[PDB]
Nucleic acid binder design. Structure first.
Ligand code: ZN
Lengths: 155, 122, 206, 80, 60, 127, 24, 98
RNA sequence: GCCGGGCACUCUAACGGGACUGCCCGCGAAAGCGGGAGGAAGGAGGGGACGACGUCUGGUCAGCAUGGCCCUUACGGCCUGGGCGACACACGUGCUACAAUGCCCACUACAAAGCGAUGCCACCCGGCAACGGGGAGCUAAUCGCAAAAAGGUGGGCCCAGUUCGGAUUGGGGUCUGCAACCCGACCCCAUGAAGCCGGAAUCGCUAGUAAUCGCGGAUCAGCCAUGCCGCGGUGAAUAC
């Protein structure tokens, strides 16, 4: 992007729940554009939440996301011929993006065999404030105020 | 199940198990139960002592397997080896035999790479 | 190199094919080979006649070769002696019994193919390259033409470093697919080398 | 695992040329380029010289090397 | 294209496997089209002049 | 009596037929759900009906030729839309805001030469 | 399984037919 | 039932020729089905531009062989008068099978 | 959709319409910018073809042509066999995979664009099979290549170097073709390697794109094509 900010792609809500946050999540699971599969993964992964948890998976999903959006991050910068890590306040767009992406990158690392399950479980341990999707969060912020020695440049 | 030449495939499905033998592949196996009646879906461990023997006595008195195949091939190789057979030579050199290229991808017959020196151009 | 033979680019809106007929799969390859054979005589014998184009209408067993000449009083010959020959010398090749029509060229100065040639001969006669070109261009401009242009390959006057002589007037929008610019190409053979003459002539609009 | 369907191929150049050697008994040296041919039991024991890229390597034929072709006995590539 | 191979390749051979194609025009043989009988260079050179009927410039 | 509409999408056409009835979809004589079995976004087809609370008032005799099953969806969807105006033109009022009478050239892009697809250029190593 | 010339997709790739992909 | 096929390279040359057959056919014939396209078959040609070696060049050439049809049911010797020898196009081929 | 019957629709293809910041709001001196609306489509609606004056003494005398020097019983011409495929290695482009968002087998559904006369081959039969014998249709919108594959349902696998992967080698066949040793593809049984996601470094791609999946053609007896040029199926992320 050089001339404009570039308009962001508006997605189609879900056929089931209707939350576009859903659509975003699946897209992230989808590999090789098999969106028909990626959808099943999420669905059956919700069914696991009803049987193992006495709550509505829609809300569960949200609380999970809500809880992984890191609010602080680092951004490399060559200040005086050197790599100074420059903490900075993260925007709503990027938060949403990072969360989903980590929810899945962590998910697939679980010791579990079935994929729908692996996702289901990450969405649970998430809310409770654990797992690894939330660990990749606290690990980031743990770099934020870690070198908050440098928060005096741009922004 | 001490089937075939000194071998014991086990805790696995029948049709899979046999694969484990030098002479048996994903073909001969299913064609050795079609000829018996044993349902492949069952595990080796859940075999009737009788069921087992039937298999054995078949398998051995028909298909050459380990104890005897590894021999026929070994010597088969020497066959043309003993003669000034082209194909033979390829066997001595440890190169491809069926007709591949020797400038690149042939690392399967040579194995580890033997990097040599070259020369400058800069 | 850049550019794209102007003609080949225009057979679509305006400019037809130099041989328009139809064919199957089994006959096309054969037909055409015989076609090209045709020009391989016309070009040779009709040099000095001021040849231009060679339309070719095919049909069943019948065929028609219309030949555009600057100087028909040559192809024809004395009362109809040469055209007689050219037909027999023609059937000798093609066992098709084909006619040969002849259409005088309304102004050889506006016919790119010819124009190019004009220069060519001039270069073989050891003429002056630079001048030969300029004059050429004006010739086209004076009569009609909305745009002219002549180029040359290299070794202008037999130098040791081939160069290119650029020259033109009016417009020559090789990009406007609604031009109708004729394009000729000569090929002079000189003692020191081969040099390539190129015409370009802009005519009309829509 | 190579094959020539139904009808083993041998060049009539030396076939009918080798059989004229059995009427008399045995010979000593034969020379023919055709290496295209498969070896027949009827040739066994003869000493055929087959052409390389430039040379003419003589090849002694045995009972155990009948299933092969002449070319299989002429190395073309000079190596090491 | 040596005259020795053009006029040559035309003569009927002892084996039909041996008969290869050449461009009727250029003499090239690396890659001629059956449909026309010319080298990929010759195809062009003509298509442009318009000497091959119905042969336009593709566009999609 | 008969409400046709015409629905084309990604090199695929869909014959749209809305007869007043109980509310069922017959595609090529087959049960809708039996045809689109396993298709997650299948339900998408019926979005335009559920748009005007008109779910179950019409039947659906629909055909289709060309394209892909996972594009046949959007295909019908549009179709159903176009016939619906026939019944009541004043319908655009809720239709267009949802943008169901739109058609985008999302078509598969010409494969260029030199390349390996539409854009996918081949890679270079030491330049 | 695109190089296992003895599987479904195996023939599909080479475009051949055999004992694993028949003519119906 | 005179089946008339018209294969050609120029759609203008066919269009007209197909019109020429259509006009004097209702004048002396009966009920005509009119001219109908097929299809139309193309012969792509992917050649390289430079005679040297630049795979990435390549010029594209096509050759469309259009197809037209004109049916004439209830054939009268009168109809076959106008359409006997009243043609004009040169790059068009016709074949009739009745 | 087989038959009548019918052109309506799908289509097929030749011509023509349709967007022009024309309208509304705001910013602007104008050009224009932002936003909205009606519209199938918006501000160049998506993609082509299309490359200025010149640059590099770019490439190419092995496509063709051509100045010049060089050979003309040979630097020419026919042929047979060999070689272009050689291997201690090294780099480029790629193909196949390391697996369970998966592999296998089975049943089942949507595509486009191409090509076809001795050619595409329906269909029957023999064979595990490649293939072969037999034989209809097509001169090709009316016949054939053809099965799309991914997908969808059922069931098998259970995390293994494995039902992952298919290299190499043994064996036995089919076909092309004068002839498949050097050096062809294909079938089938057995064999089942490296490889458990890649060092430093490095490429592509801004939307029906990428990723992934199959299909076709040119050349061609056949084929070393995992390449090339097109076709469509599904279908993202992301840009401060
Ligand atoms: Zn040529």
């Amino acid at each position: 992007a050089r001339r404009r900010r570039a308009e962001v792609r508006q997605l189609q809500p879900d056929l089931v729940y209707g939350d576009v946050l859903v659509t975003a999540f699946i897209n992230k699971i989808m590999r090789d554009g098999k969106k028909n599969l990626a959808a099943r993964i999420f669905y059956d992964a919700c069914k696991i939440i009803q049987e193992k948890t006495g709550q509505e998976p829609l809300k569960v999903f949200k609380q999970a996301v809500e809880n992984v959006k890191p609010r602080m991050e680092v951004r490399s910068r060559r200040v005086g011929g050197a790599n100074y890590q420059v903490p900075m306040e993260v925007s709503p767009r990027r938060q949403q993006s990072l969360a989903l992406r980590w929810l899945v990158q962590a998910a697939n690392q679980r010791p579990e065999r079935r994929a729908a399950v692996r996702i289901a479980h990450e969405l649970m341990d998430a809310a409770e404030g654990k797992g690894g999707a939330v660990k990749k969060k606290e690990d980031v912020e743990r770099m934020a105020e870690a070198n908050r020695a440098y928060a005096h440049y741009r922004w | 199940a001490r089937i075939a030449g000194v071998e014991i495939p086990r805790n696995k499905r029948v049709d899979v198990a046999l694969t484990y033998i030098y002479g048996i592949g994903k073909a001969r196996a299913k064609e050795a139960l079609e000829k018996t009646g044993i349902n492949p879906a069952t595990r080796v461990k859940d075999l009737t002592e009788a069921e087992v023997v039937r298999l054995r006595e078949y398998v051995e008195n028909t298909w050459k397997l380990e104890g005897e195949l590894r021999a026929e091939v070994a010597a088969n190789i020497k066959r043309l080896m003993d003669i000034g057979c082209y194909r033979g030579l390829r066997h001595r050199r440890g190169l491809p035999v069926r007709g591949q290229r020797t400038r690149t991808n042939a690392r399967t017959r040579k194995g580890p790479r033997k990097t040599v020196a070259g020369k400058k151009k800069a | 190199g850049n550019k794209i033979h102007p003609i080949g680019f225009r057979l679509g809106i305006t400019r037809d094919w130099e041989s328009r007929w139809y064919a199957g799969k089994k006959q096309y390859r054969h037909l055409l080979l015989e076609d090209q054979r045709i020009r391989g005589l016309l070009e040779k014998e009709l040099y000095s006649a001021g040849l231009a184009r060679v339309d070719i209408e095919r049909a069943a067993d019948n065929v028609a070769v219309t030949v555009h000449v600057a100087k028909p009083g040559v192809v024809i010959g004395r009362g109809g002696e040469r055209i007689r020959v050219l037909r027999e010398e023609l059937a000798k090749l093609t066992g098709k019994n084909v006619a040969l029509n002849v259409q005088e060229v309304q102004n050889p100065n506006l016919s790119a193919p010819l124009v190019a040639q004009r220069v060519a001969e001039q270069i073989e006669r050891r003429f002056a390259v630079r001048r030969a070109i300029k004059q050429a261009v004006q010739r086209v401009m004076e009569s009609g033409a909305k745009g002219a242009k002549v180029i040359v390959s290299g070794r202008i006057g037999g130098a040791e470093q081939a160069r290119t002589e650029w020259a033109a007037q009016g417009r020559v929008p090789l990009h406007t697919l609604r031009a109708n610019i004729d394009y000729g190409f000569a090929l002079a053979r000189t003692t020191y080398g081969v040099l390539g003459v190129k015409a370009y002539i802009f005519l009309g609009e829509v | 695992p190579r094959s020539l369907k139904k009808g083993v191929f041998v060049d009539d150049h030396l076939l009918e040329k080798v059989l004229e050697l059995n009427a008399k008994g045995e010979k000593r040296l034969i020379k023919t380029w055709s290496r295209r041919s498969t070896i027949v039991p009827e040739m066994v024991g003869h000493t055929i010289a087959v052409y390389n890229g430039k040379q003419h390597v003589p090849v002694y034929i045995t009972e155990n090397m009948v299933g092969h072709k002449l070319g299989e006995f002429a190395p073309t590539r000079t190596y090491r | 294209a040596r005259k020795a191979l053009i006029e040559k390749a035309k003569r009927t051979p002892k084996f039909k496997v041996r008969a290869y194609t050449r461009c009727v025009r250029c003499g090239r043989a690396r890659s001629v089209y059956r449909f026309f009988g010319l080298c990929r260079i010759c195809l062009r050179e003509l298509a442009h002049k318009g000497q091959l009927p119905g042969v336009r410039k593709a566009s999609w | 009596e008969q409400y046709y509409g015409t629905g084309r999408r990604k090199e695929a056409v869909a014959r749209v037929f809305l007869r007043p009835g109980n509310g069922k979809v017959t595609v090529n004589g087959q049960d809708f759900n039996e045809y689109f079995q396993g298709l997650v976004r299948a339900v998408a087809a019926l979005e335009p009906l559920r748009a005007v609370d008109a779910l179950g008032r019409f039947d659906a005799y629909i055909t289709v030729r060309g394209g892909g099953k996972s594009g046949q969806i959007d295909a019908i969807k549009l179709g159903i839309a176009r016939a619906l105006v026939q019944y009541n033109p004043d319908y655009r009022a809720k239709l267009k805001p949802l943008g169901f009478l739109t058609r985008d050239a999302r078509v598969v892009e010409r494969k260029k030469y030199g390349k390996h697809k539409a854009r996918r250029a081949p890679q270079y190593s030491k330049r | 399984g695109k190089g296992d010339r003895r599987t479904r997709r195996g023939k599909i790739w080479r475009g051949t037919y055999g004992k694993y992909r028949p003519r119906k | 039932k005179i089946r008339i096929k018209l294969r050609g390279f120029d759609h203008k040359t066919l269009d007209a020729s197909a019109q020429k057959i259509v006009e004097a056919a209702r004048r002396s014939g009966a009920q005509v089905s009119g001219p109908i396209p097929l299809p139309t078959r193309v012969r792509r040609f992917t050649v390289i531009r430079g005679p040297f070696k630049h795979k990435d060049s390549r010029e594209h050439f096509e050759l469309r062989t259009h197809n037209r049809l004109v049916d004439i049911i209830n054939p009268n010797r009168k109809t076959i008068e106008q359409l006997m020898t009243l043609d004009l196009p040169t790059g068009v081929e016709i074949e009739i099978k009745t």
